[PDB]
Amino acid sequence: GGSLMVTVLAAAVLAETVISVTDSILVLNPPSICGQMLLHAGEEIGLQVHLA
Amino acid sequence: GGSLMVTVLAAAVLAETVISVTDSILVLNPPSICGQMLLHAGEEIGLQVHLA
């Protein structure tokens, strides 16, 4: 489980960083864990992340 | 001519900025003016620009 979460957050931080510059982004069909962690990362970095 | 140069530099600055993060990039078949101005922009921003 820990490996899964750290993988999800590696992907999420990659998405937030490679783009950060933007004020809002959309992520399509991410894993549910990935969706939650992407929302958390967007909140922390102040980037409006939408989940589809 | 001035419009051409400013257009070329708008494109070059876009290329340098949207990517800046990278240490080296490659630009394929740019206009000769665009090639020279891309080299100038890379020198100013410290990004190793290659022209093909």
Note down, in words, how this protein is organized.
This is part of a larger assembly, with two copies of chain A (52 residues). By secondary structure, chain A is of the alpha+beta class. The first copy, chain A, is 62% helix and 15% strand. Chain A has two helices and two strands, in the order H-E-H-E. Chain A has a two-stranded parallel ribbon with strand order 1-2. The radius of gyration of chain A is 10 Å and the shape is globular. Chains A, B: Homodimer. Each MAT domain from the lovB homodimer binds one lovC molecule to form the final active lovB-lovC megasynthase complex. Chains A, B: This is Lovastatin nonaketide synthase, polyketide synthase component.
Query: Helix count of chain A?
Result: 2
Radius of gyration of chain A: 10 Å
Give me the oligomer status. Answer: part of a larger assembly
Helix content of chain A: 55-70%
Elements of chain A, N to C (H/E): HEHE
Total strand segments of chain A: 2
Q: Main sheet of chain A?
A: 2 strands, parallel
The best one-word shape of chain A is globular
Distance between the termini of chain A: 24 Å
Structural class of chain A: alpha+beta
| β-sheet strand percentage of chain A | 15-25%
Subunit structure (chains A, B): Homodimer. Each MAT domain from the lovB homodimer binds one lovC molecule to form the final active lovB-lovC megasynthase complex.
Protein name (chains A, B): Lovastatin nonaketide synthase, polyketide synthase component
PDB class: biosynthetic protein
Keywords: polyketide synthase, biosynthetic protein
